[PDB]
């Protein structure tokens, strides 16, 4: 079962950008299911549908698919929403798609957990969702942290240890992402002996390949030597390759040859 809106309230807020799945259209307008929030329909007026002049209702509505939306007025006694689609800026739709994708990933993960445990999704959200959103501001960022740092599940009471264990199993199995930091060094050496110097620089660079960050010097052509690292934190590899650059410069300068930098370490 799919219920229990991600955000703070089942009913929407004022001027909150929303995220629609259209179901049918009447003469007045479109009554549309809201997927960003739990299940409650919104009314999109015909005069407030299309940026262009209205000519083809079904060409733009696309019954059975998802789209962006904006809320204008809300009813806080029984539940009613006034919605618009014309007034969506060129850039806001991008943040809308990313919010949809992350919220839908979280929804799918927790719906998987609820289906495995046969407990209503609302209870699992009661034990997992919004205390996590209070701690970190986004459940997906906290999920990534729990992938890295397991202190995320500290201070929260789960219904059972099995729930957290199987949630960790699923997140490790599905939310598995290491960034390839790649740099290019041009050896412009003209000295007497460089192959020995190249080997010594090779050893100096490769010895600092840590347990979690293994830096390897790949060879493609004569001048261009590639330096490859798998940066898990993305803030340590650049220093590793800078140290490698210092080492290779130290090795090369004293022997007689020269080395030049072509591509510094970057993501």
């Amino acid at each position: 079962t799919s219920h229990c809106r991600f955000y703070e309230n089942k009913y929407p807020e004022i001027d909150d950008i929303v995220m629609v799945n259209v179901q049918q259209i009447a003469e007045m307008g479109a009554y549309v299911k809201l997927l960003e929030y739990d299940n409650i329909e919104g009314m999109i007026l015909l005069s407030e549908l299309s940026r262009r002049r209205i000519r083809s209702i079904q060409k733009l509505i696309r019954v059975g698919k998802n789209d962006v939306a904006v809320v204008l007025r809300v009813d806080k006694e029984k539940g009613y929403i006034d919605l618009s689609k014309r007034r969506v800026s060129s850039e806001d739709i991008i943040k809308c798609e990313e919010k949809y994708q992350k919220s839908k990933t979280v929804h799918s993960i927790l719906r998987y957990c609820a289906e495995k445990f046969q407990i209503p999704l609302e209870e699992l959200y009661k034990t997992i969702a919004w205390p996590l959103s209070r701690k970190f501001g986004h459940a997906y960022e906290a999920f990534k942290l729990s992938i890295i740092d397991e202190t995320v599940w500290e201070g929260i009471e789960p219904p059972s240890k099995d729930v957290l264990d199987e949630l960790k199993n699923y997140i490790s199995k599905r939310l598995t992402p290491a960034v390839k930091i790649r740099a290019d060094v041009e050896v412009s050496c003209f000295s007497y002996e460089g192959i020995d110097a190249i080997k010594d620089a090779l050893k100096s660079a490769e010895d600092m390949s840590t347990e979690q960050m293994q830096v390897k010097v790949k060879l493609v052509a004569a001048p261009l030597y590639v330096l490859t690292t798998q940066a898990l934190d993305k803030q340590k590899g650049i220093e590793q390759l800078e140290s490698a650059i210092e080492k290779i410069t130290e090795v090369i300068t004293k022997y007689g040859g020269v080395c030049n930098i072509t591509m510094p370490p970057k993501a």
Binding site: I195, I198, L219, A221, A222
Partner: peptide, 16 residues
């Protein structure tokens, strides 16, 4: 000629 076969690690290379 530069004797440096790509793909294979530079640990086993040749001079000029």
């Amino acid at each position: 000629f530069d004797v440096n076969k790509p793909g294979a690690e530079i640990e086993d290379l040749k001079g000029g």
